[PDB]
Amino acid sequence: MELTAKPRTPKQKLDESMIAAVAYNKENNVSFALDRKAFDRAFRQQSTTGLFDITVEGGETFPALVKAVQMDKRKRAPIHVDFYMVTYGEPVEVSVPVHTTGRSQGEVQGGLVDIVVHNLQIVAPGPRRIPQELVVDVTKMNIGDHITAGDIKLPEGCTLAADPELTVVSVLPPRLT
Amino acid sequence: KVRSSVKKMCDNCKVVRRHGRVLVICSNVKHKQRQ
Amino acid sequence: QIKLQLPAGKATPAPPVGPALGQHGVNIMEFCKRFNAETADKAGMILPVVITVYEDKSFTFIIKTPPASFLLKKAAGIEKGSSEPKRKIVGKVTRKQIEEIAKTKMPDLNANSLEAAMKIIEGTAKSMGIEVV
Amino acid sequence: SIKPTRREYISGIPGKGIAQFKMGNNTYPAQVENVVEKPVQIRHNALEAARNAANRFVQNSGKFRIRKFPFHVIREQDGDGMRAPFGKSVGTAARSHGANHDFIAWVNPDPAVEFAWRRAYMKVTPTVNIDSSPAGNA
RNA sequence: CCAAGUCUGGGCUAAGUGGUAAAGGAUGUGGCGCCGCGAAGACAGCCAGGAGGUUGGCUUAGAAGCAGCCAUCCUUUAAAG
RNA sequence: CUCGAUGUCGGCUCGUCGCAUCCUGGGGCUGAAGAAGGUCCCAAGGGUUGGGCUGUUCGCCCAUUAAAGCGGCACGCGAGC
């Protein structure tokens, strides 16, 4: 949303209210613009979890946003970001999240819980074609069970930029099973 | 009493400033908070 | 002017109703045998009461639909409770049965409508261990 | 930064003796956690402990995860007196590099665990920073 | 005291801090962002009913929010506790 | 620093500070009625005993007492024993 800059001035820039952030795209880049105030708001929403874009000179109103960056620093306040769009029908490198609900199985009865080393899902469905919020939770939880890649259950866009059997999300003893 | 490290008893016990001093107060002998 | 929880068919258990009512202003014996005149129509199952005492040291009064949580137990068949609700949950009951039980408690029970009535049944049977499975 | 004699000649190859990592429960978004800023050969023991007392006060779901762990150690009095000092080991930990990802109170809505960790900081030693993660804490 | 502007400009102190110190506290004070609203006329004053199936499970000799281990739901209605 | 030299333990005497105060006043606290204790904040004025056995201090014991304090100053003092 907006964000400007692109000359050659990171220090002061990298200072005050404007944080660096390259204009990255397949084939071309352009001095860092943006701002340490927009990043906020938007970013605050769900960086590489949905997507939008800003109007700098109406130039090229496109999506793709961030494919890297960091609040690095100790303090925990980012500085020096990466920005890449995608006006193509190739959209792959697509990492969008996936949520459950709380389906009661090991929890609200077994107190047991479940780790989700997954959460996210870098895949590649129908380029410029993804539900900013995709949910899938067949339920199940408790004892020494576990679910991961393999099973899963992918809708429409048949990608999987990923593999089978691997960090899905299981149920462990928040105390004992 | 605790001179050092006072922090709210009864769901009331107030925060007062005497001599810049901060000494707990609240409807209870069981709160005579002071530092 | 006092609320109590006493058994039917019975009336004068030294320990429970001797002290209380006895001091709050109540002739334990009379009210006792007055109770027996009541809970003699629904013995075996506990019955609560709101015995009040004015200015003379006597009287009594109402008997209100016992506390669900427990009346439900008298229907299924289980003394106390597993050991903790939603932690030891394993007391599966049934619908209809349930819907036909709350249809009998309606009285001191919430309003006079199914949904409501039935719902509270699902509530109580939950806090103890009686799952609406 | 004086450190030890080697990873297998003086004292290197241990378990360090402690109480493992993970606790609490999952959670996809909710970012609930703790880190620091202080530098200190984190007092093993003190360490191990601390964190633990953490579970002691909570119990289940709240990423009682914790990303620390000592692995080297000091030494001192053993032998003659003060001069040519050989070495007697004791007390390993790990450098808390001037702040960083401590342990995580990670989960949907379960501050009942935030306060926890909280109780976890209180403890600890080197001050500590109370914080949230990508998003905050819900 | 001892030579040299009790210079001018605009902030911040109300403790003599300055004139040695840490963890640990607190509507101190001054400057920045958030959630709810004041004509569903808002927080702290005042009038009033301070709702019912809630008086569920371990322990009961007593949980029946106001011993503590698990629940955390339904409601006829001014809402919920 | 001192070996072209500062005589070291305990005792004696003569003491002088200090406060985390043993006695003593003033306080708030208590699971404090009384009375007596316990807890902790304020205050050093004054004061805080005879013997025993031990080179000892320390220490245990004997009879007191309100009390029978902790520690400084080369763990004060040999040009004073």
XYZ file of C-alpha atoms (C1' of nucleotides) in Angstrom:
645
model
C 0.000 0.000 0.000
C 1.908 3.017 -1.298
C 5.455 2.800 0.095
C 8.006 4.767 -1.939
C 11.740 5.330 -2.330
C 14.380 3.671 -4.524
C 17.348 6.023 -4.862
C 20.469 5.129 -2.937
C 20.102 5.959 0.762
C 19.780 3.140 3.330
C 21.383 4.516 6.500
C 19.148 7.539 7.187
C 16.375 5.698 5.367
C 17.139 2.529 7.297
C 16.415 5.138 9.956
C 13.465 7.194 11.162
C 10.192 6.118 9.581
C 11.290 4.456 6.328
C 12.691 0.935 6.304
C 14.512 -0.490 3.303
C 12.751 -3.010 1.070
C 13.898 -3.902 -2.439
C 11.620 -3.857 -5.477
C 12.246 -7.487 -6.451
C 10.775 -9.157 -9.528
C 11.678 -11.852 -12.041
C 14.160 -10.008 -14.254
C 14.496 -6.602 -12.578
C 15.091 -4.830 -9.285
C 15.013 -1.178 -8.238
C 16.446 0.727 -5.251
C 14.752 0.022 -1.930
C 11.601 1.954 -1.037
C 8.643 1.267 1.249
C 8.721 2.709 4.778
C 8.950 1.820 8.467
C 5.258 2.445 9.130
C 3.494 0.705 6.270
C 5.365 -2.548 6.808
C 3.494 -2.225 10.083
C -0.190 -2.192 9.305
C -0.116 -4.547 6.322
C 2.724 -6.803 7.423
C 0.752 -6.841 10.666
C -1.996 -8.534 8.654
C -0.130 -11.559 7.383
C 2.877 -10.964 5.149
C 3.505 -13.879 2.780
C 0.206 -15.322 4.057
C -2.249 -13.451 1.801
C -0.926 -10.663 -0.444
C -1.625 -7.166 -1.804
C 0.611 -4.447 -3.241
C 1.099 -0.655 -3.305
C 0.693 2.169 -5.810
C 4.036 3.852 -6.453
C 3.429 6.084 -9.467
C 0.584 3.731 -10.345
C 3.644 2.143 -11.924
C 2.707 -1.526 -11.759
C -0.106 -2.449 -9.355
C 0.931 -6.091 -8.780
C 1.041 -8.746 -6.000
C 3.691 -11.146 -4.673
C 4.929 -8.798 -1.941
C 7.504 -10.412 0.337
C 9.396 -13.670 -0.175
C 11.973 -12.813 2.478
C 12.979 -10.276 5.127
C 13.463 -10.110 8.893
C 12.762 -8.150 12.050
C 16.317 -9.398 12.592
C 18.024 -6.951 14.934
C 17.965 -7.892 18.587
C 15.346 -5.374 19.604
C 12.970 -7.314 17.333
C 12.130 -4.505 14.896
C 12.785 -5.421 11.226
C 15.017 -3.422 8.879
C 15.971 -4.238 5.265
C 13.246 -6.231 3.501
C 12.790 -8.117 0.226
C 9.920 -7.557 -2.233
C 8.961 -9.541 -5.325
C 5.754 -9.501 -7.382
C 4.236 -11.928 -9.884
C 2.065 -10.810 -12.809
C 2.508 -14.288 -14.269
C 0.464 -17.483 -14.427
C 3.346 -19.449 -12.933
C 2.792 -18.640 -9.236
C 4.434 -21.563 -7.416
C 6.563 -20.535 -4.793
C 3.246 -20.163 -2.960
C 3.400 -20.530 0.821
C -0.019 -20.002 2.382
C -1.179 -21.117 5.846
C -3.604 -23.795 7.015
C -5.748 -23.830 10.165
C -7.709 -26.302 12.278
C -10.381 -25.431 14.842
C -10.031 -27.393 18.073
C -11.923 -30.552 17.214
C -12.214 -32.274 20.586
C -10.370 -35.616 20.746
C -7.208 -35.562 22.862
C -7.757 -32.120 24.344
C -11.152 -31.274 25.844
C -11.203 -34.826 27.224
C -7.663 -36.200 27.279
C -6.011 -32.854 27.939
C -3.441 -34.222 25.510
C -2.305 -31.814 22.795
C -0.467 -31.740 19.471
C 2.598 -30.145 17.872
C 2.273 -28.531 14.445
C 5.775 -28.114 13.020
C 3.748 -27.349 9.896
C 1.207 -24.557 10.099
C 2.363 -23.096 6.786
C 2.444 -24.688 3.327
C 4.848 -23.512 0.629
C 3.278 -25.009 -2.476
C 2.250 -23.846 -5.952
C -1.446 -24.068 -6.921
C -3.078 -22.076 -9.718
C -0.764 -19.057 -9.964
C -2.500 -15.859 -8.885
C -5.085 -18.370 -7.662
C -5.169 -19.171 -3.937
C -7.604 -18.771 -1.005
C -5.674 -16.416 1.325
C -7.064 -18.633 4.099
C -7.237 -22.381 3.507
C -8.472 -24.665 6.279
C -8.211 -28.440 6.587
C -8.616 -30.512 9.740
C -9.889 -34.084 9.502
C -9.626 -34.055 13.307
C -8.117 -36.876 15.387
C -5.807 -36.493 18.394
C -4.463 -38.349 21.431
C -2.260 -41.283 22.474
C 0.817 -41.920 20.319
C -0.813 -40.900 17.045
C 0.592 -38.492 14.455
C -0.310 -37.080 11.030
C 1.877 -35.409 8.411
C 2.509 -34.977 4.693
C 1.414 -38.178 2.977
C -2.218 -38.173 4.081
C -2.874 -34.425 4.258
C -5.653 -33.697 1.729
C -5.121 -31.073 -0.977
C -8.029 -29.182 -2.626
C -8.126 -27.807 -6.197
C -4.696 -26.590 -7.318
C -2.736 -29.847 -7.258
C 0.780 -28.780 -6.264
C 2.535 -29.872 -3.080
C 5.813 -28.060 -3.701
C 6.369 -30.321 -0.697
C 6.751 -34.031 0.060
C 4.969 -36.881 1.919
C 5.253 -38.004 5.554
C 6.782 -34.992 7.309
C 6.010 -32.398 10.006
C 2.204 -32.348 9.794
C 1.000 -32.081 13.396
C 0.574 -34.798 16.017
C -0.802 -35.218 19.535
C 1.577 -35.418 22.480
C 1.139 -35.634 26.262
C 0.860 -32.089 27.578
C 1.441 -34.199 30.691
C 0.904 -37.924 30.011
C -0.991 -40.335 27.746
C 6.856 -3.654 56.380
C 8.516 -5.233 53.340
C 10.332 -1.936 52.882
C 11.476 -3.437 49.577
C 9.060 -5.007 47.073
C 5.415 -4.104 47.719
C 2.551 -5.029 45.353
C -1.238 -4.919 45.998
C -3.120 -7.260 48.353
C -6.827 -7.134 49.008
C -8.445 -6.438 45.646
C -8.148 -2.790 46.687
C -5.105 -2.005 48.802
C -4.150 1.337 47.256
C -1.010 2.921 45.833
C -0.177 6.123 47.758
C 2.740 8.558 47.645
C 4.076 10.041 50.891
C 7.427 11.741 50.630
C 7.649 10.454 47.077
C 7.534 7.342 49.231
C 5.201 4.555 48.164
C 3.436 2.772 51.022
C 0.588 0.288 50.475
C -2.823 1.159 51.866
C -6.068 -0.818 52.073
C -8.840 -1.636 54.526
C -6.641 -4.199 56.306
C -4.072 -4.441 59.081
C -3.053 -7.307 56.809
C -1.750 -4.933 54.160
C 0.139 -2.209 56.071
C 2.318 -2.125 52.970
C 5.376 0.135 53.320
C 8.923 0.470 51.975
C -35.781 -18.746 56.420
C -33.280 -21.463 55.490
C -32.466 -23.734 52.535
C -31.806 -27.463 52.910
C -31.066 -30.722 51.087
C -32.679 -33.784 52.672
C -33.713 -37.351 51.769
C -37.299 -38.536 51.355
C -38.953 -41.242 53.455
C -36.545 -39.987 56.106
C -36.921 -37.171 58.640
C -34.608 -36.773 61.642
C -30.959 -37.705 60.944
C -29.333 -36.188 64.052
C -26.198 -35.032 62.181
C -27.637 -33.232 59.119
C -30.986 -31.690 60.121
C -30.487 -31.656 63.898
C -28.030 -28.731 64.093
C -28.955 -26.454 61.185
C -32.737 -26.007 61.111
C -32.475 -26.742 64.839
C -30.617 -23.485 65.490
C -31.760 -21.282 62.597
C -35.201 -21.550 64.218
C -36.955 -24.834 63.455
C -38.504 -27.746 65.355
C -36.485 -30.549 63.769
C -38.961 -33.283 64.789
C -42.224 -31.695 63.620
C -40.829 -30.468 60.299
C -39.182 -33.897 60.108
C -42.392 -35.907 60.345
C -43.976 -33.244 58.144
C -41.335 -34.057 55.533
C -42.051 -37.783 55.900
C -45.643 -36.850 55.098
C -44.199 -35.608 51.802
C -41.156 -37.463 50.450
C -43.277 -40.550 51.160
C -44.525 -40.148 47.596
C -41.040 -40.129 46.057
C -38.835 -42.086 48.466
C -35.404 -43.395 47.458
C -34.604 -40.225 45.529
C -33.232 -37.159 47.332
C -35.425 -34.046 47.590
C -34.387 -30.453 48.425
C -36.440 -28.024 50.528
C -36.744 -24.347 51.461
C -37.886 -24.522 55.091
C -38.602 -21.104 56.603
C -39.209 -20.034 60.206
C -41.038 -16.798 61.071
C -41.837 -15.582 64.589
C -42.814 -18.449 66.890
C -40.232 -21.132 66.145
C -42.183 -23.341 63.733
C -43.625 -24.024 60.272
C -42.009 -25.356 57.093
C -43.116 -25.060 53.459
C -42.070 -26.069 49.934
C -40.319 -28.978 48.214
C -38.665 -27.902 44.949
C -37.636 -30.596 41.424
C -34.318 -31.815 42.905
C -30.916 -30.696 41.512
C -30.702 -32.152 37.998
C -27.077 -33.291 38.110
C -28.284 -35.873 40.643
C -31.796 -36.693 39.392
C -30.288 -37.639 36.026
C -28.104 -40.160 37.863
C -31.221 -41.772 39.353
C -32.390 -42.456 35.796
C -29.261 -43.971 34.242
C -27.953 -45.981 37.203
C -24.753 -44.802 38.875
C -24.052 -43.712 42.463
C -21.359 -41.042 42.676
C -19.343 -39.902 39.654
C -16.459 -41.415 37.696
C -13.879 -39.087 39.276
C -13.876 -35.922 37.148
C -15.995 -34.569 34.254
C -14.429 -34.078 30.816
C -11.356 -35.793 32.262
C -12.760 -39.244 33.001
C -15.714 -38.751 30.667
C -17.078 -42.205 29.868
C -20.702 -42.049 31.007
C -22.511 -42.262 27.681
C -26.292 -41.906 27.897
C -28.954 -41.418 25.216
C -31.284 -38.897 23.567
C -34.993 -39.734 23.666
C -34.443 -41.176 27.135
C -33.011 -37.773 28.033
C -35.724 -35.841 26.170
C -38.334 -37.962 27.944
C -36.741 -37.307 31.335
C -36.603 -33.509 31.099
C -40.211 -33.701 29.927
C -40.861 -34.964 33.458
C -38.762 -32.366 35.298
C -40.092 -29.393 33.315
C -41.427 -28.010 36.636
C -38.649 -26.260 38.582
C -36.799 -26.744 35.294
C -36.077 -23.901 32.875
C -39.230 -22.427 31.315
C -41.695 -24.819 29.666
C -40.098 -25.730 26.333
C -38.154 -28.712 24.976
C -34.980 -27.139 23.578
C -34.420 -25.287 26.843
C -35.313 -28.147 29.193
C -33.387 -30.776 27.226
C -30.380 -28.460 26.957
C -29.842 -28.169 30.713
C -29.855 -31.972 30.777
C -26.932 -31.964 28.344
C -25.303 -29.386 30.607
C -25.548 -31.215 33.925
C -24.796 -34.640 32.461
C -21.626 -32.872 31.287
C -20.157 -31.313 34.432
C -20.253 -34.678 36.230
C -19.594 -37.315 33.562
C -22.940 -38.032 31.905
C -22.085 -37.491 28.237
C -24.872 -36.852 25.736
C -23.269 -39.479 23.506
C 35.664 -15.360 27.102
C 37.790 -18.077 28.753
C 36.439 -21.469 27.680
C 37.382 -25.165 27.952
C 40.349 -27.708 27.602
C 38.751 -29.438 24.664
C 35.762 -31.411 23.548
C 37.229 -34.694 24.737
C 40.532 -34.110 26.620
C 39.376 -31.898 29.506
C 35.621 -32.178 29.560
C 33.687 -32.467 26.308
C 31.059 -35.033 25.302
C 28.376 -34.882 28.016
C 24.649 -34.639 28.549
C 25.243 -31.627 30.761
C 22.506 -32.989 33.012
C 19.196 -31.135 32.706
C 15.447 -31.424 31.982
C 14.889 -31.543 28.180
C 13.058 -28.968 26.039
C 9.405 -29.055 24.999
C 6.275 -28.613 27.097
C 2.937 -26.822 26.912
C 0.889 -27.407 23.771
C 0.993 -26.624 20.026
C -1.280 -23.615 17.974
C -0.668 -22.310 14.453
C -0.671 -18.494 14.848
C -0.633 -17.215 18.461
C 2.972 -16.247 19.116
C 3.621 -16.338 22.865
C 7.226 -16.410 24.098
C 10.290 -15.132 25.972
C 13.848 -14.015 25.243
C 16.599 -11.893 26.690
C 19.377 -9.439 25.922
C 21.841 -10.282 28.658
C 25.127 -12.095 28.064
C 25.981 -14.858 30.545
C 27.308 -18.417 30.563
C 23.696 -19.094 31.523
C 23.879 -20.773 34.913
C 23.121 -24.342 33.930
C 21.460 -25.644 37.084
C 19.858 -22.284 37.805
C 18.803 -22.844 34.208
C 17.538 -26.401 34.038
C 15.675 -25.431 37.168
C 13.998 -22.135 36.362
C 12.372 -23.261 33.116
C 11.132 -26.305 35.028
C 9.552 -24.454 37.948
C 7.842 -22.957 34.897
C 5.954 -26.180 34.199
C 5.544 -26.591 37.950
C 3.126 -23.673 37.979
C 1.266 -24.312 34.708
C 0.970 -27.900 33.411
C -0.126 -28.410 29.770
C -0.781 -26.178 26.715
C 1.263 -22.985 26.431
C 4.812 -24.102 23.590
C 6.605 -24.517 26.911
C 9.266 -24.932 24.261
C 12.615 -23.456 25.253
C 15.631 -22.943 22.989
C 18.600 -23.015 25.403
C 21.222 -25.447 26.676
C 24.727 -25.057 28.169
C 27.632 -27.192 26.948
C 30.897 -25.890 28.399
C 32.129 -24.984 31.878
C 34.468 -23.334 34.436
C 36.823 -24.748 37.108
C 38.855 -23.699 40.202
C 40.031 -24.784 43.670
C 41.598 -28.283 43.697
C 45.168 -29.188 44.768
C 47.900 -26.944 46.220
C 46.345 -23.506 46.882
C 46.306 -20.658 44.351
C 49.430 -20.795 42.152
C 49.924 -23.244 39.260
C 46.233 -24.152 39.026
C 45.469 -27.505 37.414
C 41.666 -27.656 37.101
C 38.559 -29.126 38.683
C 35.415 -28.767 36.577
C 31.838 -27.888 37.552
C 28.914 -25.889 36.156
C 28.305 -25.922 32.405
C 25.773 -23.835 30.488
C 25.774 -21.773 27.272
C 26.304 -18.181 26.142
C 23.070 -16.253 25.969
C 24.350 -14.176 23.061
C 23.266 -10.674 24.066
C 19.604 -11.501 23.607
C 17.851 -13.960 21.313
C 15.060 -16.502 20.877
C 14.544 -17.843 24.406
C 11.697 -20.258 25.109
C 8.214 -20.011 23.599
C 4.790 -19.624 25.193
C 3.114 -20.508 21.923
C -0.588 -21.186 21.465
C -3.977 -19.815 20.401
C -5.720 -18.001 23.274
C -4.009 -19.313 26.439
C -2.510 -16.434 28.417
C -3.196 -18.652 31.405
C 0.190 -19.757 30.100
C 1.576 -16.312 29.342
C 1.331 -15.371 33.006
C 3.036 -18.718 33.507
C 6.240 -18.183 31.551
C 5.916 -14.768 33.132
C 6.347 -16.624 36.408
C 9.106 -18.237 34.347
C 10.898 -14.948 33.764
C 10.466 -13.609 37.296
C 12.736 -16.551 37.951
C 15.617 -17.035 35.557
C 18.338 -14.574 36.528
C 19.637 -12.073 33.946
C 16.551 -9.846 33.877
C 14.772 -11.243 30.811
C 12.525 -9.747 28.171
C 8.739 -10.300 28.134
C 7.508 -10.415 24.551
C 5.328 -11.746 21.731
C 5.999 -13.173 18.250
C 4.886 -12.722 14.611
C 1.453 -11.244 15.233
C 1.964 -10.824 18.982
C 0.006 -13.055 21.366
C -3.601 -13.014 20.110
C 37.362 31.887 45.697
C 40.790 32.078 39.938
C 41.424 34.484 34.152
C 37.226 34.467 31.143
C 29.441 35.293 28.435
C 24.746 35.612 36.388
C 25.408 34.772 26.466
C 21.206 34.188 23.694
C 17.708 29.842 21.507
C 14.218 25.735 22.472
C 13.318 21.404 25.444
C 13.406 18.573 30.581
C 13.979 18.787 36.336
C 10.692 20.222 41.752
C 14.776 14.745 44.014
C 19.726 18.569 45.628
C 19.688 13.815 41.416
C 23.642 16.064 40.093
C 28.120 14.909 44.127
C 29.536 6.552 42.734
C 25.726 0.773 42.346
C 22.532 -3.965 40.590
C 17.760 -7.379 40.556
C 13.433 -5.685 42.048
C 8.659 -1.803 42.391
C 4.902 2.065 41.636
C -2.925 6.086 37.685
C 5.431 10.573 39.408
C 6.127 13.612 35.264
C 6.561 15.148 29.883
C 6.235 13.560 24.474
C 4.426 9.532 20.983
C 0.450 4.623 18.870
C -3.997 1.366 20.356
C -9.758 -0.984 22.344
C -14.986 1.174 24.042
C -17.916 5.389 23.535
C -21.526 10.697 25.515
C -27.611 12.159 22.465
C -27.684 1.952 21.823
C -25.874 10.491 26.065
C -19.650 7.049 28.148
C -15.595 5.255 33.587
C -15.639 6.662 39.320
C -21.701 9.405 42.162
C -27.034 7.858 43.139
C -32.439 4.652 42.675
C -33.347 -0.745 42.186
C -33.955 -6.380 41.085
C -28.663 -7.587 43.310
C -32.599 -14.056 37.770
C -33.605 -19.481 37.300
C -32.213 -25.723 35.797
C -27.047 -23.626 38.244
C -27.387 -26.226 45.493
C -22.899 -30.599 38.992
C -17.594 -34.803 40.144
C -12.841 -36.362 44.027
C -13.447 -35.516 49.113
C -18.298 -35.211 51.455
C -17.860 -35.732 57.874
C -18.295 -29.869 53.978
C -17.934 -27.486 47.358
C -23.382 -26.301 46.842
C -18.485 -19.331 42.710
C -16.502 -17.512 48.741
C -11.815 -25.628 51.378
C -9.248 -27.555 47.141
C -8.676 -32.030 42.025
C -12.099 -31.880 37.342
C -16.714 -28.965 34.620
C -17.774 -24.657 32.088
C -23.205 -26.017 29.724
C -28.840 -25.141 29.188
C -32.326 -21.525 29.845
C -38.208 -18.969 30.417
C -37.146 -13.870 30.080
C -35.016 -6.858 31.448
C -28.960 -10.909 30.704
C -26.747 -14.163 30.757
C -22.375 -14.157 34.927
C 55.743 0.580 51.412
C 58.943 -1.857 56.258
C 64.777 -7.090 56.569
C 70.184 0.402 58.151
C 64.167 -3.751 61.007
C 56.315 -1.698 62.184
C 58.229 -5.985 69.117
C 53.477 -10.719 67.094
C 49.020 -14.195 70.903
C 45.683 -13.533 75.612
C 45.773 -10.059 79.877
C 45.987 -5.080 82.111
C 44.556 -0.169 82.165
C 42.647 4.089 79.404
C 39.102 4.115 75.856
C 36.942 5.969 71.227
C 34.047 5.705 67.725
C 29.356 2.402 64.531
C 24.400 0.223 64.099
C 22.539 -4.138 61.126
C 20.039 -1.913 69.185
C 21.439 -6.703 74.144
C 18.823 -3.273 78.415
C 16.665 1.051 77.558
C 11.960 4.980 74.795
C 8.777 5.699 70.566
C 6.084 3.273 67.150
C 2.925 -0.231 63.192
C 2.095 -5.965 63.083
C 0.143 -10.567 65.466
C -2.757 -16.359 64.628
C -2.376 -9.490 70.306
C -7.723 -9.206 75.095
C -5.054 -9.355 80.218
C -0.139 -10.458 81.264
C 3.735 -11.943 79.052
C 5.868 -13.156 74.242
C 6.621 -13.026 68.516
C 7.274 -9.572 63.656
C 9.446 -5.192 61.702
C 10.161 0.428 61.096
C 12.979 4.970 64.441
C 16.040 6.163 67.807
C 22.394 5.323 70.202
C 21.485 8.211 75.601
C 22.919 6.063 79.211
C 24.003 1.358 80.632
C 25.178 -4.206 79.309
C 27.385 -7.318 86.836
C 30.896 -11.930 90.492
C 32.946 -16.515 89.919
C 34.603 -21.154 87.894
C 38.163 -24.250 84.368
C 41.002 -22.992 80.669
C 48.052 -19.134 78.378
C 43.877 -18.070 76.051
C 39.544 -15.051 73.140
C 35.750 -18.772 72.280
C 33.584 -21.618 75.105
C 30.713 -24.692 78.780
C 29.208 -24.262 84.204
C 27.826 -21.599 88.724
C 24.431 -16.961 91.342
C 22.493 -12.471 89.506
C 20.101 -8.935 86.318
C 16.163 -4.932 82.675
C 20.080 -6.229 80.008
C 23.730 -9.296 80.926
C 24.955 -6.528 72.416
C 27.693 -7.305 67.012
C 32.080 -4.772 65.504
C 35.926 -0.826 64.330
C 40.797 1.559 65.303
C 47.696 -2.238 62.784
C 41.452 -8.097 65.087
C 43.444 0.206 69.616
C 47.226 0.078 72.329
C 55.603 -2.831 74.844
C 59.079 3.742 74.039
C 52.459 1.938 79.595
C 53.132 -3.259 82.733
